[PDB]
């Protein structure tokens, strides 16, 4: 799992950004994004529709760094679920524990959030958890397990959260090193630059 390649390279490919280069050197740019993801990257191929949609899904996966398989599982899970499966999917990926950590901003990327997770730094409700994929149920209280709390990285992290966004559906505590996931994020909320439906049909094939 975990792509772990040049974190930024993907933003160069997708023509967008995964915000992996959070705030300090700030705006990516210092990378020459899009200009040439690989070798003769200056080219802008027609990109047949299968390609634009494939690129769409890749884009999303890359964002949350999820592997194709587990991602598909999420897809299918979203399929059986009520509601236009499309946005239901986002309801799934946002529920990502690690991703919640990024939302709660204890990390600065998704990767950082994983490392926090794998290293048990974040207990939830009344238990430490290491499965970054631990789906986070509504009204789920969760915080950094104090034994590893106050690692300066989280300090600077929350400080970097100011210039982030502060997602509304969630209930971050910030000061006391805590966060509480309320209701599942509505489609209208997050990014919206992506057209999840694109991924939906992507598996129509």
Partner RNA sequence: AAUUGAAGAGUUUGAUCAUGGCUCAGAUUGAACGCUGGCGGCAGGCCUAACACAUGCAAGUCGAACGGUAACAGGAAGAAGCUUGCUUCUUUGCUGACGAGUGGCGGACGGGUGAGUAAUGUCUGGGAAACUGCCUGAUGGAGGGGGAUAACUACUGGAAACGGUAGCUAAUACCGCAUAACGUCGCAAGACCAAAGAGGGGGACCUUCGGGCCUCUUGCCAUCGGAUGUGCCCAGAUGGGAUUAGCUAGUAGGUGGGGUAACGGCUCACCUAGGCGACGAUCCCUAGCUGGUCUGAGAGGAUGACCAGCCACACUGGAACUGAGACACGGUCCAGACUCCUACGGGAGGCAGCAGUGGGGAAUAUUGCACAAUGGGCGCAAGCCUGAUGCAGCCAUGCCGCGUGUAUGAAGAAGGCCUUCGGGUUGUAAAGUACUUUCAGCGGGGAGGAAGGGAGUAAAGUUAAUACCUUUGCUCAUUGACGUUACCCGCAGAAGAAGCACCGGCUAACUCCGUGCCAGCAGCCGCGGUAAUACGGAGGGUGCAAGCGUUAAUCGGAAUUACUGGG
Partner RNA sequence: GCCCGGAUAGCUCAGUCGGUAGAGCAGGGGAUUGAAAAUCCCCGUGUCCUUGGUUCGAUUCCGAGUCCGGGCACCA
Subset of residues 16 to 75 that bind RNA, contact rule: CB under 7 A: 20-25, 30-32, 35-43, 45, 47-51, 53-55, 57-58, 61, 67-71, 73
Residue 5 CA to its chain's centroid (Å): 16
Instruction: Tell me how far apart the alpha carbons of residues 67 and 191 are, in angstroms, rounded to a whole number.
Output: 21
Paired tokens of 56? 């769409």
Instruction: Tell me how far apart the alpha carbons of residues 205 and 200 are, in angstroms, rounded to a whole number.
Output: 10
Which lies closer to RNA via its Cβ, residue 70 or residue 139? 70
Strand ranges, E, within the chain: 122-124, 127-128, 140-144, 170-172, 178-181
> Considering only residues 60, 92, 111, 144, which one is a binding residue for RNA as defined by CB under 7 A?
111
Which lies closer to RNA via its Cβ, residue 50 or residue 173? 50
| Binding residues for RNA restricted to 139-198, rule: CB under 7 A | 147-148, 151-153
Which lies closer to RNA via its Cβ, residue 156 or residue 192? 156
Minimum distance of RNA from residue 180's CB (angstroms): 21
Minimum distance of RNA from residue 140's CB (angstroms): 17
> Considering only residues 27, 125, 131, 191, which one is a binding residue for RNA as defined by CB under 7 A?
131
- Asked if 165 contacts 176 with a C-beta cutoff of 8 angstroms, the reply is no
Instruction: Tell me how far apart the alpha carbons of residues 67 and 58 are, in angstroms, rounded to a whole number.
Output: 10
């Amino acid at each position: 799992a975990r792509y772990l390649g040049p974190k930024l390279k993907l933003s160069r490919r997708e023509g967008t950004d995964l915000f992996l280069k959070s705030g300090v050197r700030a705006i990516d740019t210092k990378c020459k994004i899009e200009q040439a993801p690989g070798q003769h990257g200056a080219r802008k191929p027609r990109l047949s529709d299968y390609g634009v949609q494939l690129r769409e899904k890749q884009k999303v996966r890359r964002i949350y760094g999820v592997l194709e398989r587990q991602f598909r599982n999420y897809y299918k899970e979203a399929a059986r679920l009520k509601g236009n499966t499309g946005e239901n999917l986002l309801a799934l990926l946002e529920g990502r524990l690690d991703n919640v950590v990024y939302r709660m901003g204890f990390g600065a990327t998704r990767a950082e959030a994983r490392q926090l997770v794998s290293h048990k730094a974040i207990m939830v409700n009344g238990r430490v958890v290491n499965i970054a994929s631990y789906q986070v149920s509504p009204n789920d209280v969760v915080s950094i397990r104090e034994k590893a709390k106050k690692q300066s990285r989280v300090k600077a992290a929350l400080e970097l959260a100011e210039q982030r966004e502060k997602p509304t559906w969630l209930e971050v505590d910030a000061g006391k090193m805590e966060g509480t996931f309320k209701r599942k994020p509505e489609r209208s909320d997050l990014s919206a630059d992506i057209n999840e439906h694109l991924i939906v049909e992507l598996y129509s094939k």
